[PDB]
Amino acid sequence: SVDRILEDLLVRFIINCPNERELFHFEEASWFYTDFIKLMNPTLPSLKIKSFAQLIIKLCPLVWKWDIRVDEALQQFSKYKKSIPVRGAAIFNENLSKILLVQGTESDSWSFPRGSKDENDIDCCIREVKEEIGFDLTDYIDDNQFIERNIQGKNYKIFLISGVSEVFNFKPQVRNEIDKIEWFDFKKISKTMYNIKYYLINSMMRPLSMWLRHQRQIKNEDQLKSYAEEQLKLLLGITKEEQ
């Protein structure tokens, strides 16, 4: 059942806690069921960090130790981690076969293009991709798809893009910041994973893969919707454009 999952989620995360922070355990559980249960149980609601964290407080009120607020504690957790935030994009090709990666000028590790005093997360990603690859991702950015993980303070929020041209002559705007840009066959990355150095991609090989499958079913079927759009018009009689 729906509540059988919510139960199991606390049995895996909330119960691995003893013996000795619980705000991360709460974030991790929310990520697990956000980047796995979403793609598998598509009907279920995509409940937020605070909400899912409150949802547990009502069902297992025995796990909560102090008398300090729910919302106040998530403020505190984000307050602690408020050092330098990082945002990026995972750019895939038209056929959903390869991902476009970048290798730094100081490190040989291959991460997604990543990196504002007032601008939002989307503007940061658009501007950092435009500075490290040349392609102004404005046209392709979907605000409702992303993966998130906090690495030793720095928060990493990667956006997911597909259908980008393999033929495209990418060149960096900031010359001495991005040493190399290359397309990587996705299947291969997964097999090579454990001589080549991969930074963030390794932490999200599973959600990236699941999302690729989701973006493929949606593409293959979208094609049979265009097919039937035409196949029905070229038989449904008086169909044109008079206005």
Binding site: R4, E7, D8, V11, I15, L62
Partner: peptide, 18 residues
């Protein structure tokens, strides 16, 4: 209490999954 009840609830997840 929690330690003991945990020995009864987690069983209904391992025995049902695989």
């Amino acid at each position: 209490q929690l330690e003991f009840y945990r020995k009864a609830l987690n069983f209904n997840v391992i025995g049902r999954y695989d």
